[PDB]
Design an enzyme around this catalytic site. Structure first.
Site, PDB file in Angstrom:
ATOM      1  N   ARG A  62      21.553  14.402 -30.692  1.00  0.00           N
ATOM      2  CA  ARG A  62      20.504  14.795 -31.615  1.00  0.00           C
ATOM      3  C   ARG A  62      20.754  14.278 -33.029  1.00  0.00           C
ATOM      4  O   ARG A  62      21.898  14.076 -33.447  1.00  0.00           O
ATOM      5  CB  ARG A  62      20.354  16.321 -31.647  1.00  0.00           C
ATOM      6  N   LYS A 210      15.081  20.116 -26.987  1.00  0.00           N
ATOM      7  CA  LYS A 210      15.351  21.005 -28.113  1.00  0.00           C
ATOM      8  C   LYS A 210      14.190  21.173 -29.083  1.00  0.00           C
ATOM      9  O   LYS A 210      14.120  22.167 -29.821  1.00  0.00           O
ATOM     10  CB  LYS A 210      16.609  20.552 -28.832  1.00  0.00           C
ATOM     11  N   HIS A 229      19.667  31.147 -26.960  1.00  0.00           N
ATOM     12  CA  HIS A 229      20.369  29.928 -26.633  1.00  0.00           C
ATOM     13  C   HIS A 229      21.528  30.405 -25.762  1.00  0.00           C
ATOM     14  O   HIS A 229      22.666  30.575 -26.229  1.00  0.00           O
ATOM     15  CB  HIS A 229      20.877  29.284 -27.913  1.00  0.00           C
ATOM     16  N   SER A 247      27.022  23.758 -28.020  1.00  0.00           N
ATOM     17  CA  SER A 247      27.203  22.632 -27.133  1.00  0.00           C
ATOM     18  C   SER A 247      28.660  22.584 -26.671  1.00  0.00           C
ATOM     19  O   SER A 247      29.579  22.794 -27.466  1.00  0.00           O
ATOM     20  CB  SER A 247      26.812  21.349 -27.880  1.00  0.00           C
ATOM     21  N   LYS A 251      28.583  27.412 -21.430  1.00  0.00           N
ATOM     22  CA  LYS A 251      27.365  28.026 -20.915  1.00  0.00           C
ATOM     23  C   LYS A 251      27.007  27.527 -19.527  1.00  0.00           C
ATOM     24  O   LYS A 251      26.738  28.307 -18.619  1.00  0.00           O
ATOM     25  CB  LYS A 251      26.184  27.771 -21.843  1.00  0.00           C
ATOM     26  N   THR A 252      27.016  26.213 -19.376  1.00  0.00           N
ATOM     27  CA  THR A 252      26.674  25.594 -18.111  1.00  0.00           C
ATOM     28  C   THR A 252      27.733  25.810 -17.032  1.00  0.00           C
ATOM     29  O   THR A 252      27.432  26.343 -15.967  1.00  0.00           O
ATOM     30  CB  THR A 252      26.354  24.093 -18.312  1.00  0.00           C
ATOM     31  N   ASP A 266      20.547  27.214 -20.249  1.00  0.00           N
ATOM     32  CA  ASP A 266      20.489  26.919 -21.676  1.00  0.00           C
ATOM     33  C   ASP A 266      19.555  27.669 -22.628  1.00  0.00           C
ATOM     34  O   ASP A 266      19.918  27.920 -23.772  1.00  0.00           O
ATOM     35  CB  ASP A 266      20.228  25.416 -21.805  1.00  0.00           C
ATOM     36  N   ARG A 330      25.661  12.855 -20.220  1.00  0.00           N
ATOM     37  CA  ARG A 330      24.901  13.929 -19.595  1.00  0.00           C
ATOM     38  C   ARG A 330      24.256  13.516 -18.293  1.00  0.00           C
ATOM     39  O   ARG A 330      24.265  12.343 -17.924  1.00  0.00           O
ATOM     40  CB  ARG A 330      23.750  14.359 -20.509  1.00  0.00           C
TER      41      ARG A 330
END
Ligand SMILES: Nc1ncnc2c1ncn2[C@@H]1O[C@H](COP(=O)(O)OP(=O)(O)OP(=O)(O)O)[C@@H](O)[C@H]1O
Ligand SMILES: [Ca+2]
Ligand SMILES: [Mg+2]
Length: 537
Positions: A62, A210, A229, A247, A251-252, A266, A330
């Site tokens: 980003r 996003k 988030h 990031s 989480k994943t 996410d 990714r």
């Protein structure tokens, strides 16, 4: 020109649209990406795993500096502007005039060619979801949004009316930028009156993902719905757990657990009925990916998944360890590539377990702590973690950061607005909060995925809530005396140091950073009162 009429696109300012490829199937996308005549960044390569891999160009993450929101009568008094009161943020104001110039660049760019238009939903619930229309001239970009957003049924497409339009003009740039006071020739602009997002210069798919999250973050809290988030999953007993984090903090990886049904990895909302996924896919990080440690994520990489920036060798085999292009490699895949998921609709009941994931680079915070109601608010607002990704971390970082609500880069309203609605939802459900350090300790190495998984299990099965605990000084975090499946040694962060005095040093430095960061919230009686819940030297 196929499904959609060329004249409907003319309303957006696009002309001479030659051919429209409406809601392409996965098979058409596969064929499109592998077209031998593609050149540049449009080109797709076939890997030995069956998935197609692409190169997003210069932008492998980003570009917060190129994010602008039009300041007009709709957003003026509601948005958390970067140039207003205390608040480090990326919500830079844009003039309707400059916006019109940018729009002209993108529509001109998309004019006279073959376009891919994908209609999809953002939000699993019919009552609060956004019907979004994406327009791109690059096949793999359409593929990305097909994977990430909620794919409508044939009957849903029948009466589909777009609430928001996203125009991806990655191939064009703004040469008048210096003259217009913009950061660069690239741009990620939003206009809430026109309900559109324009992307120019950057090919990075994450901007669309996003960008819509930023819009949900604006609309939902305004109607009392938490926009989060976080990743989320449900156990067979109907118990929901939410994992907040930046990031690369887990989480994943931590929500993808075979014993639990995955809701999403996410972005989630929280209304009167419960927690719902905004997306229809997952966007996993692949550097150092090993099938042994992450079998579920590894197996999801197959036909229809879309690899980004990974190194593909001559024989088509992937080198997941290679981060020379970027550490932010990714792969996106529709949610169904994971076997144990909630379906047909990605939603569940109210969350009773709220886990804040922090990748502590200082090696000060304990592996796990049970938070008090005040500490919950304090730590949520502080959002301490590491920027280990988002454009290229895991070696160019970890950059210690305080990201409000664990996602400051996507907040459209003031951090306190997200905190209050979240606290409201937690109270009604009797939810408990925990702080988990997925980062480092005194060994200079990250806490093992195995110890972290055992900790998550202990939290979910309640063994943590019934454990004897003692208070960690300064931070005043309640840490368990022992935990089933976890090495007792790591539970106290001071033990991983040859001397707890070494810990003291670093802990005092970190505590000061926390006190410094929080002072910007002490303006209200509430923020001022929360100071007591933070570190004390
Ligand atoms: N103990 C640990 N717990 C969690 N992740 C770990 C741990 N040790 C190493 N990791 C690595 O850290 C990364 C965490 O990535 P993950 O995709 O879960 O981040 P995320 O929170 O989902 O980030 P984003 O918001 O970018 O999607 C993975 O590459 C994982 O292999
Ligand atoms: Ca994210
Ligand atoms: Mg993720």
């Amino acid at each position: 020109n196929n499904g959609l009429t060329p004249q409907e696109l003319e309303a957006y300012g696009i002309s001479d649209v030659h051919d429209i490829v409406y809601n392409p199937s996965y098979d058409l996308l596969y064929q499109e990406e592998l077209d031998p005549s593609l050149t540049g960044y449009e080109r797709g390569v076939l890997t030995n795993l069956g998935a197609v891999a692409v190169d997003t160009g210069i932008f492998t993450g980003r570009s917060p500096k190129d994010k602008y929101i039009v300041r007009d009568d709709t957003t003026r008094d509601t948005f958390w502007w970067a140039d207003k009161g205390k608040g480090k943020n990326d919500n830079k104001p844009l003039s309707p005039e400059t916006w019109q110039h940018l729009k002209g660049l993108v529509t001109r760019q998309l004019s006279g060619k073959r376009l891919f238009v994908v209609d999809a939903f953002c939000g699993a619930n019919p009552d609060t979801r956004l019907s979004v229309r994406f327009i791109t001239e690059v096949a793999w970009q359409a593929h990305f949004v097909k994977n990430m957003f909620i794919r409508p049924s044939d009957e849903e497409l029948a009466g589909f009316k777009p609430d928001f339009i996203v125009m991806n003009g990655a191939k064009c740039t703004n040469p008048q930028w210096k003259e217009q006071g913009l950061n660069s020739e690239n741009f990620v602009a939003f206009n809430l009156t026109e309900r559109m997002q324009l992307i120019g210069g950057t090919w990075y798919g994450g901007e669309m993902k996003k960008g819509m999250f930023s819009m949900m973050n604006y609309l939902l809290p305004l109607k009392g719905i938490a926009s989060m988030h976080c990743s989320a999953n449900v156990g067979e007993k109907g118990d929901v757990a939410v994992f907040f984090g930046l990031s690369g903090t887990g989480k994943t990886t931590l929500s993808t657990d075979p014993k639990r049904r995955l809701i999403g990895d996410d972005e989630h909302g929280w209304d009167d009925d419960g927690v719902f996924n905004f997306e229809g896919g997952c966007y996993a990080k692949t550097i150092k990916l090993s099938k042994e440690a992450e079998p579920e994520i590894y197996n999801a990489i197959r036909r229809d998944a879309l690899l980004e920036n990974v190194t593909v060798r001559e024989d088509g085999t992937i080198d997941f360890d290679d981060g020379s292009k970027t550490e932010n490699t990714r792969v996106s895949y529709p949610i169904y590539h994971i076997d144990n998921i909630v379906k047909p609709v990605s939603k569940a009941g109210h969350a009773t377990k709220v886990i804040f994931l922090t990748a502590d680079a200082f090696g000060v915070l304990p592996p796990v702590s049970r938070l008090t109601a005040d500490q919950t608010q304090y730590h949520f607002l502080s959002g301490f973690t590491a920027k280990l990704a988002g454009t290229e971390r895991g070696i160019t970082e970890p950059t210690p950061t305080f990201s409000a609500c664990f996602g400051a880069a996507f907040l459209s309203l003031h951090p306190t607005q997200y905190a209050e609605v979240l606290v409201k939802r937690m109270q009604a459900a009797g939810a408990q909060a925990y702080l988990v350090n997925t980062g480092w300790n005194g060994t200079g190495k990250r806490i093992s995925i195995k110890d972290t998984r055992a900790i998550i299990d202990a939290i979910l099965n309640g063994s943590l809530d019934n454990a004897e605990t003692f208070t960690l000084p300064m931070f005043n975090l309640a840490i368990p005396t022992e935990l089933p499946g976890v090495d007792t040694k790591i539970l106290d962060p001071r033990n991983t140091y040859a001397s707890p005095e070494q810990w003291q040093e670093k802990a005092e430095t970190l505590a000061k950073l926390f006190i410094d960061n929080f002072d910007k919230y002490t303006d209200t009686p509430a923020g001022a009162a929360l100071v007591a819940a933070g570190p004390k030297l």
